[PDB]
Short mmCIF file of C-alpha atoms in Angstrom, two decimals:
data_model
loop_
_atom_site.label_atom_id
_atom_site.label_comp_id
_atom_site.label_asym_id
_atom_site.label_seq_id
_atom_site.Cartn_x
_atom_site.Cartn_y
_atom_site.Cartn_z
CA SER A 1 0.00 0.00 0.00
CA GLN A 2 1.26 3.46 -1.11
CA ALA A 3 0.99 4.39 2.62
CA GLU A 4 2.93 1.48 4.05
CA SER A 5 6.04 3.12 2.66
CA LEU A 6 4.81 6.75 3.00
CA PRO A 7 7.00 8.73 5.38
CA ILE A 8 5.74 10.74 8.29
CA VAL A 9 6.40 14.40 8.57
CA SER A 10 7.84 14.47 12.13
CA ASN A 11 11.02 12.90 10.74
CA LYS A 12 11.23 14.48 7.31
CA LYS A 13 11.12 17.79 9.22
CA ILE A 14 14.17 17.03 11.27
CA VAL A 15 16.17 16.59 8.03
CA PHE A 16 14.63 19.64 6.28
CA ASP A 17 15.35 22.22 9.02
CA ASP A 18 19.00 21.03 9.33
CA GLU A 19 20.28 22.31 6.01
CA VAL A 20 17.96 25.31 6.03
CA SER A 21 19.44 26.27 9.41
CA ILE A 22 22.77 26.55 7.59
CA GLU A 23 21.93 28.29 4.32
CA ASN A 24 20.71 31.05 6.55
CA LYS A 25 23.69 31.52 8.94
CA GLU A 26 26.27 30.95 6.21
CA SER A 27 24.49 33.04 3.70
CA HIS A 28 24.22 35.73 6.47
CA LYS A 29 28.06 35.51 6.91
CA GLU A 30 28.65 36.62 3.20
CA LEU A 31 26.58 39.81 3.80
CA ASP A 32 27.48 43.39 4.67
CA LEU A 33 25.38 45.82 6.83
CA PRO A 34 24.54 49.26 5.16
CA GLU A 35 24.05 52.05 7.79
CA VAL A 36 21.07 54.34 7.06
CA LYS A 37 21.43 57.52 9.18
CA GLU A 38 17.60 57.65 8.96
CA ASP A 39 16.85 61.24 7.75
CA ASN A 40 17.76 62.86 11.23
CA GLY A 41 21.44 62.32 12.00
CA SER A 42 20.50 59.17 14.01
CA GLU A 43 21.52 55.67 12.81
CA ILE A 44 19.26 52.73 11.77
CA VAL A 45 20.91 50.08 14.00
CA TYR A 46 20.61 46.37 12.87
CA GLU A 47 19.88 44.30 16.04
CA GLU A 48 16.89 42.63 17.75
CA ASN A 49 17.79 42.70 21.49
CA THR A 50 17.84 46.07 23.42
CA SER A 51 17.93 44.48 26.98
CA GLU A 52 17.69 47.64 29.10
CA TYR B 1 44.10 60.67 54.17
CA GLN B 2 43.49 58.10 51.38
CA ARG B 3 42.65 58.59 47.67
CA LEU B 4 39.73 56.47 46.60
CA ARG B 5 40.00 54.81 43.27
CA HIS B 6 37.93 56.12 40.42
CA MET B 7 35.01 54.14 41.75
CA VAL B 8 32.74 56.84 39.98
CA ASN B 9 30.79 56.60 36.53
CA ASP B 10 31.40 60.37 36.27
CA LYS B 11 30.92 59.82 32.51
CA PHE B 12 27.93 62.00 31.92
CA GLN B 13 26.82 61.29 28.33
CA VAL B 14 24.63 63.68 26.42
CA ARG B 15 22.33 62.86 23.52
CA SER B 16 21.54 65.44 20.83
CA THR B 17 20.82 62.51 18.48
CA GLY B 18 22.53 59.28 17.36
CA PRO B 19 22.10 55.46 17.29
CA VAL B 20 18.58 54.02 17.41
CA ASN B 21 17.08 50.65 16.66
CA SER B 22 15.66 48.77 13.69
CA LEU B 23 12.51 47.60 15.28
CA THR B 24 11.56 50.53 17.52
CA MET B 25 13.31 53.74 16.29
CA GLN B 26 13.85 54.78 19.85
CA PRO B 27 17.59 55.16 20.58
CA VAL B 28 19.15 52.26 22.58
CA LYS B 29 21.43 52.31 25.70
CA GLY B 30 25.16 53.21 25.39
CA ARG B 31 27.05 55.96 27.32
CA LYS B 32 30.11 55.32 25.09
CA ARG B 33 27.86 55.17 21.98
CA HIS B 34 25.73 58.18 22.97
CA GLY B 35 22.82 56.15 24.28
CA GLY B 36 19.67 58.00 25.08
CA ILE B 37 18.57 58.31 28.70
CA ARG B 38 15.65 56.10 29.78
CA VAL B 39 12.31 57.59 30.63
CA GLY B 40 11.16 54.60 32.71
CA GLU B 41 7.74 53.70 34.07
CA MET B 42 8.27 55.80 37.23
CA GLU B 43 8.93 59.19 35.63
CA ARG B 44 5.96 58.47 33.33
CA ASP B 45 3.72 58.94 36.39
CA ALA B 46 5.53 61.95 37.79
CA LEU B 47 4.70 63.98 34.81
CA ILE B 48 1.20 62.51 34.68
CA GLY B 49 0.68 63.81 38.18
CA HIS B 50 1.49 67.47 37.69
CA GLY B 51 -0.80 67.50 34.77
CA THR B 52 1.63 68.13 31.90
CA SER B 53 0.20 66.19 28.97
CA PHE B 54 2.75 67.93 26.72
CA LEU B 55 5.94 67.27 28.60
CA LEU B 56 4.69 63.72 28.45
CA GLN B 57 4.28 64.12 24.69
#
């Protein structure tokens, strides 16, 4: 039965995320960061954690 | 007498304008990167009290 050898997602996931997790860090390692002194004199900073 | 080590911040830090943040626009902490001073939840009230809707603004 075409369901007796049909995979289950729980496990295909664990292989899919793996690679993806890389082509995102690595690809983010071959990228520069262009500062945009947002029309003010300020500075559009490029983070995601101001822990005050 | 004894001279106490520079155990002081002293380092004022002003903020005409400089570094902000991508997700909020509000300037972030710093002191050495000209970080804006925090208007925390306490001072929020203070102003509220007096009745200065503008200073708040």
